[PDB]
RNA sequence: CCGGCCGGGAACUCAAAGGAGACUGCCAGUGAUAAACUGGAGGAAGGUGGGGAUGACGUCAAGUCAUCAUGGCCCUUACGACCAGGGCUACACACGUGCUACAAUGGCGCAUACAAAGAGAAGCGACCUCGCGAGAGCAAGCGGACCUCAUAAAGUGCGUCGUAGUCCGGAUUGGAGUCUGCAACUCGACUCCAUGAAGUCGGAAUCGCUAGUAAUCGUGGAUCAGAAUGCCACGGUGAAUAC
C-alpha cells in the first residue's frame, strides 16, 4: 500500500518510466494498480516581449508538470530487490508516500 | 552594468544573513502578550540594514530590480532570451 | 416629535430619524434602540412621551450634537495652534490624509477657478 | 495612528534627550531625525527638526501628545 | 435496469440514470422545485419530456455538477437526450429536428493580452 | 455584413406562455444579463394588463401591438443632397422589433414607482392609443408621408 | 524586429529543449543561475575549441554536461586529462559532482551555430563579409541540405542609409512548425561596432 | 456514527496519455464538360466548427546606449562611491485611461444551492479562545485531486424604504486602532465611531462590440516585507441588431 509518485516537465518520458515501472512489476506477475491521471500543474507567465515600451504585445509561456503515481501494493521480494535502475531518467522526480 | 548596485545588494544580503534569524523568530514571542520594560527597551535597539526588507528582489544576469520573476531568478528580457534559447526546462510558448 | 432640529424627522422610521440628527447615524442608532428596548421598525410619528423621553436619555448618555461639533472644531483649531503638516492643509484648504493634489483634490478645494 | 503596544523612540533621540535634561537650560542642536515620538513627561526641549536644505527650529508645547517630530518641519517649498 | 446521459452544457457536467417507474425526478438529493424550480430556466429540463409528452412513465435521477443555474439545466437537459438516444433512433430523429441532440459548443473566451476583455479593446481617443 | 447574411440569434421561448414574441420582448426589455428579473417585471406587467383589460389576452395583445408597431420605416439613404426618406416594405421582424424597442423606451420615460406598472401602463396606452410609443410611431409615419418621394 | 524565435516555437514539438532536467522553484531559480554560470564558462573556455551545444541534465546532486562539438580531440586533449580537469572546475563552481560527455556534430559547416561564429571570426578577421556569406551557403550546399539564410547586420562598410543584406536560394520555411529549421545569432566586435549575424538552416528530410 | 461510511467491476463525472473522428465526405441544383457556389441526409461541431500561437519583402533614420553588449566622446583627487534626511506622491490649471455612483431594474437586515482557474515552506495557515472590529499564542494539515486561501456574488424568497439630493452614492474631515516593516508626518491598506460636497444620466465631439459577444457579477495570480480602481487570467447570468 505504498505509492510511488514521479513528477516531469515530459509526459512522453514520464510515460515511458512507468511503463518500465509497470512492465518490471509485471514481467513475472503480480496484482500491481497501474498508474493514475493525477491532474498536471501548469504555471503560466505574462512577460513583457520588448524591452521599454509595450502596449498589446506579451508574450505567454508555460510548464506543465506532468504527475503520476503507480501505487505498489504487491510486495515481490525481487521487485523490492530490484526495482532501482530501471528507466535511468535524469529528468524524473521520484517520491514515496505511504 | 550597475555593478555598485549588484554590490550594495550582496552586501545588505550577507549582513542580513548575519544578522537575522538568531533572534529574529523571538521577536514577535517576546514583544508579544503572553496568555516600560528594560526588555522592551532593548528590543528598541535594533539596526535597520539588517532587516529584509533592506533587500530588492533584483536579476542575476543584469541586476535590473523591475520585471523580475521569482521562479527564474531573472528580469523580463532574460527570461524570454533563456526561453527562446531552449535553456530553460519545460518553458514552452504558451499558445491557449 | 422633535428633539433639537430644524426640521421633523416625524413620517419615518425610528433609525432614520436618529440619522437625521446630528453627531448620530446608524449603527449608534441601532445602539441607542436597543439600549432604549424601542423597536426599529416602528415610527418616532404617533410614539408615546415616555418613550420619547427614554430616547432623549439615551442620547443625553452619549454626546450630544454641538458639543461634538464644538470638540471637533477645537480638534482642528489644536492642530492650527500645533502648526503642523495636518494644520497646514488646513489653513492651505488642501487634503490632508496624504492624497494627490495633480488631480482630484476638488472637494478640499471647492468648485474649479481658472 | 501606530501601534498602542510601542511608541517609536530613537536610542540617539533619547540620549540628546537625556543629556539635555541633565543639562537643563540649553540652545537648539540640530537632530536629523523625524521619526519620533514626543511625550508630556518631556515636553519642553527647543530641539530642531531638519528637512533638506534648511534647518528650522521647534519649540514643543503643552498639547502635544503623540505627534512626529518631522511634523512641524515644513520639507516642501511652495510660494 | 438502467438507461444513462452524461450532457454538457459549457462549464456542467451531468449524470442521469433512469429505471421505468414514477415520475418524480430528483436533483442532486433534492427535487427540481427544490434545486432550481423557483429559479429561471427551468423548462429546459421538461422540454425533451414534454417534446414526446410522457409524465409518469419513467423515473430519473440525475446528479450535475460544475457551472450555473442554466449551464447545470442545459446539462441536464441534454443528459435527457443522451437517455433518449440510448432508448430509440426514431426518437433521435425527432429530436435532431426539434434541435435537442447537439451538444453546445459555445464556451466562454479566453481573455487577451492588450485587451479589457474578452473581445471588448480598451477605448483609444482620436488624437 | 457585406459578404452575406447573417441572421438573428435563435431564441427559447417563456416557460409562462410559451411564445418567442414575449421571450423576444424579454429579451429587449433586459438589461445586464438579468433574465430572471427582466421576466418577473414581463410577468407581472401581463398580469396587470390582463386584470386591467378582462377581455381575451391574445386579441388585446395583437390590437396593442399593431397599434406600437410602424407599417412604415424612416430611411436617410444619403443618395440626393444627403437627404432622403423613401418609404419602403418592413420586415415584420423589424416591424414587432421597432414596437417592442419603442414600448420599453416609453416605459423608460414613464415616471411612476415600478417598472412593472409603467409596462403596465404602457401597454394599456397602447390598446386606448395613448401612448407614448404610440405617438413616436405617429411621428414616424407622418415624417414617411411628408417626406415620401417615390410612389 | 518581427519574426518570432524559431527555436523557441519549435521546442514543443521538434526542437529538443537546450536543458531537460526537473527542479522545484526555490532550486529551480538556483539551478538557472548554475547553468548560466556553466554555461558561460564552457563557452569562454571552449571557444577555441568552436563548439555547438551544450546540454545540461542535473539529477539535483550531480551534473552532467554533454558538449556537441565539431572537434572531439581539442576538448578531451591530452589522455583525457585536460577535459578532466574542466570537469573538476566544472564541479568546482556548481558545488555538485560532475560528468562530461562529449557528442561529436558531423558536417560543422551545416551545424548553425558553428556558422555563425564562422562568420563572427571572418568580420574579426576583417575579410569581406559578403564572401563569407557566398562561401557559407555555397559550403552547406556542398556538403548538406538544401536550405539556409544568412543575415548580416550593423555597420556593413559604415554607410549612413542603414541597411541588412540577406542572401537567399533554397527554401527556409519559418511557419511551418514540422521541419527543423536549426537557428542562431552571434555578435561580431570590430573598431567600427558589433556586427549581428542570424542564421536558418533545415538538416534533413522529414 | 446520516458525516459519501467499506469488499467491489470500477459502471459514471473527472483527470492524462495513446487514438478514432470532420476530410466538400455523399447526394441534388448552379457553374462550360473545370475550379467552385447553394441546399439536404447522417453526425458532437460542415464548409480554414470556435479561439490562440504563428506577423513575408519592406516603410516610419519609429522606440530602447535607462535590461544588456558595443564604436566614438567625456569625468577619471568627481559626470565615481558610502551615508543621514527630503523629492520622485508638489498644485492657480489642461489632456488621456479607468473606478464609484446619480437609483426602485435599486438601498438595508435574515435565509438559500453550485462554479472554473489558480497559488502556498524567510509560506498557505482551518479550527480553540475574546471582541457589534481591523484582528492578538507553543492550533492541526500541506511542500500539494487530501490541508488552507475559499463564506462565491449577481440571482432566488421575504420584511422595509415609495421616487425625495432621498435607508442612493461615497468624496472630504475629526476621534479610537489592527497588520506589515528597525521606523506609516511628507508617504500603505483596512475596519470601530461621527459628518455626508458635488452628483437629478452629462454640450460640441468621440470610443468598443456580430455570440457565449457586448453588458453585468464575483474569483485567482505576477511583482509583493506591507500596499492594485491597473495588468494578466478564470468562471455565473447573458442580450439587441446586421435590409
Redesign the interface.
Known sequence: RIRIRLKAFDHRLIDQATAEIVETAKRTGAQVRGPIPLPTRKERFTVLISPHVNKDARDQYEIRTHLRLVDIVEPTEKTVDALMRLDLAAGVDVQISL | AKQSMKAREVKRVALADKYFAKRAELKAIISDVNARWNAVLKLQTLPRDSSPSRQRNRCRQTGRPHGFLRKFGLSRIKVREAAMRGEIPGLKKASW | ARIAGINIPDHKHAVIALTSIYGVGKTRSKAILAAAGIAEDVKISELSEGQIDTLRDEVAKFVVEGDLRREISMSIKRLMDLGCYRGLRHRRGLPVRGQRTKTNARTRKGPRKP | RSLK??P??D?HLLKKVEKAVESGDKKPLRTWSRRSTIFPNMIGLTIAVHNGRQHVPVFV?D??VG?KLG??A?TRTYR | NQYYGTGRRKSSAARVFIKPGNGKIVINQRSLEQYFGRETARMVVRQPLELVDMVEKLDLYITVKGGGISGQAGAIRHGITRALMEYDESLRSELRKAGFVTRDARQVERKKVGLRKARRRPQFSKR | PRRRVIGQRKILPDPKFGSELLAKFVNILMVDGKKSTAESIVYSALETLAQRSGKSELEAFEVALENVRPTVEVKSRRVGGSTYQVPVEVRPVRRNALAMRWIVEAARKRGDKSMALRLANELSDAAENKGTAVKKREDVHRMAEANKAFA | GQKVHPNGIRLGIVKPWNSTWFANTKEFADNLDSDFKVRQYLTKELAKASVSRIVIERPAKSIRVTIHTARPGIVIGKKGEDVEKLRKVVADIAGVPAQINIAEVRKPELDAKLVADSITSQLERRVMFRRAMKRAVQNAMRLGAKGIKVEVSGRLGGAEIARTEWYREGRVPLHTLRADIDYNTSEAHTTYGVIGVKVWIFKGEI
Open positions: 503596544k510601542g517609536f523612540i536610542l508645547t498639547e502635544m505627534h511634523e512641524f515644513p
